[PDB]
Design an enzyme around this catalytic site. Structure first.
Site, mmCIF file in Angstrom:
data_model
loop_
_atom_site.group_PDB
_atom_site.id
_atom_site.type_symbol
_atom_site.label_atom_id
_atom_site.label_comp_id
_atom_site.label_asym_id
_atom_site.label_seq_id
_atom_site.Cartn_x
_atom_site.Cartn_y
_atom_site.Cartn_z
ATOM 1 N N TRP A 1 0.819 -1.212 0.000
ATOM 2 C CA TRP A 1 0.000 0.000 0.000
ATOM 3 C C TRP A 1 0.848 1.256 0.000
ATOM 4 O O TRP A 1 1.778 1.388 0.794
ATOM 5 C CB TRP A 1 -0.867 0.066 1.250
ATOM 6 C CG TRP A 1 -1.952 -0.966 1.510
ATOM 7 C CD1 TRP A 1 -2.658 -1.079 2.685
ATOM 8 C CD2 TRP A 1 -2.467 -1.994 0.644
ATOM 9 N NE1 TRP A 1 -3.570 -2.094 2.597
ATOM 10 C CE2 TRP A 1 -3.481 -2.676 1.362
ATOM 11 C CE3 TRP A 1 -2.195 -2.405 -0.663
ATOM 12 C CZ2 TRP A 1 -4.211 -3.740 0.821
ATOM 13 C CZ3 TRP A 1 -2.926 -3.479 -1.203
ATOM 14 C CH2 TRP A 1 -3.920 -4.124 -0.457
ATOM 15 N N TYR B 1 -10.539 -15.861 -3.152
ATOM 16 C CA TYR B 1 -10.707 -16.323 -1.787
ATOM 17 C C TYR B 1 -11.915 -17.256 -1.721
ATOM 18 O O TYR B 1 -12.979 -16.867 -1.248
ATOM 19 C CB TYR B 1 -10.883 -15.131 -0.855
ATOM 20 C CG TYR B 1 -9.620 -14.319 -0.695
ATOM 21 C CD1 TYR B 1 -8.581 -14.801 0.076
ATOM 22 C CD2 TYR B 1 -9.456 -13.076 -1.327
ATOM 23 C CE1 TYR B 1 -7.421 -14.081 0.245
ATOM 24 C CE2 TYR B 1 -8.289 -12.346 -1.165
ATOM 25 C CZ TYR B 1 -7.276 -12.863 -0.370
ATOM 26 O OH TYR B 1 -6.108 -12.183 -0.167
ATOM 27 N N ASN C 1 -7.280 -0.857 -4.501
ATOM 28 C CA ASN C 1 -7.360 -2.232 -4.066
ATOM 29 C C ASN C 1 -8.811 -2.679 -3.955
ATOM 30 O O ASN C 1 -9.562 -2.126 -3.172
ATOM 31 C CB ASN C 1 -6.684 -2.416 -2.704
ATOM 32 C CG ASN C 1 -6.859 -3.812 -2.159
ATOM 33 O OD1 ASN C 1 -6.464 -4.779 -2.791
ATOM 34 N ND2 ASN C 1 -7.458 -3.924 -0.972
ATOM 35 N N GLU C 2 -9.181 -3.681 -4.751
ATOM 36 C CA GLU C 2 -10.476 -4.374 -4.630
ATOM 37 C C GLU C 2 -11.711 -3.444 -4.741
ATOM 38 O O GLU C 2 -12.623 -3.480 -3.898
ATOM 39 C CB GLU C 2 -10.530 -5.193 -3.328
ATOM 40 C CG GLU C 2 -9.455 -6.275 -3.271
ATOM 41 C CD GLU C 2 -9.663 -7.312 -2.183
ATOM 42 O OE1 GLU C 2 -10.302 -7.015 -1.158
ATOM 43 O OE2 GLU C 2 -9.151 -8.430 -2.336
ATOM 44 N N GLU D 1 -3.727 -11.807 -5.449
ATOM 45 C CA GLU D 1 -4.009 -12.256 -4.092
ATOM 46 C C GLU D 1 -4.626 -13.657 -4.123
ATOM 47 O O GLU D 1 -5.616 -13.906 -4.836
ATOM 48 C CB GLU D 1 -4.984 -11.323 -3.351
ATOM 49 C CG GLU D 1 -4.422 -9.987 -2.888
ATOM 50 C CD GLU D 1 -5.357 -9.183 -1.974
ATOM 51 O OE1 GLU D 1 -6.201 -9.767 -1.254
ATOM 52 O OE2 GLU D 1 -5.247 -7.932 -1.960
ATOM 53 N N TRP E 1 -1.276 -13.823 -0.459
ATOM 54 C CA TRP E 1 -1.606 -13.019 0.696
ATOM 55 C C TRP E 1 -1.424 -13.936 1.906
ATOM 56 O O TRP E 1 -2.136 -14.924 2.025
ATOM 57 C CB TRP E 1 -3.053 -12.486 0.612
ATOM 58 C CG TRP E 1 -3.385 -11.588 1.763
ATOM 59 C CD1 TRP E 1 -3.737 -11.984 3.014
ATOM 60 C CD2 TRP E 1 -3.353 -10.162 1.791
ATOM 61 N NE1 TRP E 1 -3.941 -10.891 3.822
ATOM 62 C CE2 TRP E 1 -3.715 -9.758 3.088
ATOM 63 C CE3 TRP E 1 -3.086 -9.172 0.840
ATOM 64 C CZ2 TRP E 1 -3.800 -8.411 3.455
ATOM 65 C CZ3 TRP E 1 -3.159 -7.836 1.211
ATOM 66 C CH2 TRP E 1 -3.518 -7.473 2.499
#
Length: 370
Positions: free
Chosen positions: A59, A250, A174-175, A289, A331
């Site tokens: 980040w 995920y 991010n995302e 990720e 991750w």
């Protein structure tokens, strides 16, 4: 000029193909801030280099209110910024390249919510975090920060971030999610606006959006539980300023309550469909990720190692046969003595010899591809 670039569906550097095998460590700047914890950054890059990991994603914004980078619109903590300077100089020292995310979708600090609330305090009557994507003042805050980060003269290397080949790619956000506009138009327009602006400041570096990879309506059956999210893997990545695509994955988080078998089927399908689309887009695909949490019931490390092996094998099989897989980042890595940062997904390399060997073997195999 030593910058990583793309040639069709592969990354490249100095005329040769490049395959990514790396890690996420969002916390690097945060830990570099304190001189008494900065050694953990050094140690992490030393370990990464030993296991032949070549990229860290991190980040370029603060995640906590107490230790901000951008404390208010256009106002920066110079000690925090100098910590980011060190992340870049130290990455270079150990032969590691960086992907640098410019804002978070999530959370109270460092995310789109904070940008919106800053505008609210300055008189804008905004009721949604998704106003980040449309409000001229907020967009101006974001563009200002893009310029501040990209043109920053590193106090250690004396090279502007935009001129430093240690940075492999910028990442817009991010995302990102835009639940308030499931047509996808709001977010598409924002990516068009921001990629163009960013490339006007820095066209030395690659740029990627930061998508988890969710499709729009026609291909939604590939998304977890068939939701759409306001992004569109296909149309968003057609934007000219975007050099390569990413997915996150995920299966346990996204499909809670489904069987392991259904989760595995979703996961293999998820990678393969994005391979197909990234090839169609003529851009490399990075799995930015993936991971396995210790909070999974009955966990032992073999479950994590076998999962990494599966993901790495899929990447390798694709890359070797000439497909668009440019690599993977798990991750996440934590340094030693950072248990307060534990989220279940942490790999402490010094304490994880089986996992580190899985990682190393993937780097060795990829190193023999052209």
């Amino acid at each position: 000029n030593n910058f990583v670039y793309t040639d069709g569906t592969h990354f490249a550097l100095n005329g040769k193909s490049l395959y990514i095998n790396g890690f996420n460590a969002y916390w690097l700047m945060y830990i570099a801030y304190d001189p008494s914890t900065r050694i953990k950054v050094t140690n992490t890059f030393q370990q990464a280099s030993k296991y032949k990991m070549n990229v860290a994603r991190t980040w370029a914004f603060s995640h906590g209110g107490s230790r901000p980078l951008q404390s208010a619109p256009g106002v920066y903590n110079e000690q925090m910024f100098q910590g980011l300077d060190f992340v870049i100089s130290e990455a270079k020292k150990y032969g590691i390249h960086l992907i640098m995310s410019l804002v978070n979708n999530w959370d109270a600090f460092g995310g789109k919510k904070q940008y919106v609330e800053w505008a609210v305090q300055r008189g804008q009557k905004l009721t949604s975090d998704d106003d980040f994507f449309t409000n001229p003042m907020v967009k101006g805050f974001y563009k200002n920060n893009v310029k501040v980060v990209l043109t920053r003269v590193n106090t250690i290397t004396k090279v502007a971030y935009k001129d430093d080949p240690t940075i492999l790619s910028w990442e817009l956000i991010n995302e990102p999610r835009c639940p308030s506009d499931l047509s996808g138009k709001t977010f598409q327009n924002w990516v068009l606006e921001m990629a163009g602006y960013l490339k006007s400041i820095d066209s030395n570096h690659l740029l990627e959006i930061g998508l988890e990879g969710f499709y729009g309506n026609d291909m939604r059956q590939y998304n977890p539980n068939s939701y759409i999210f306001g992004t569109n893997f296909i149309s968003n990545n057609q934007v000219q300023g975007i050099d390569f695509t990413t997915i996150h994955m995920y299966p346990n988080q996204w499909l809670p309550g489904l069987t392991q078998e259904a989760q595995d089927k979703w996961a293999s399908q998820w990678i393969q469909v994005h391979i197909d689309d990234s090839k169609m887009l003529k851009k490399p695909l990075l799995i930015a990720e993936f991971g396995k949490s210790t909070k999974t019931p009955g966990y032992t490390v073999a479950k994590r190692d076998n999962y990494f092996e599966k993901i790495y094998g899929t990447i390798f099989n694709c890359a070797k046969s000439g497909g668009p897989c440019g690599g993977g980042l798990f991750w996440q890595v934590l340094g030693q003595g950072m248990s307060s940062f534990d989220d279940g997904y942490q790999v402490v390399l010094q304490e994880s010899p089986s996992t580190s060997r899985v990682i190393l073997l993937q780097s060795l195999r990829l190193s023999k591809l052209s």
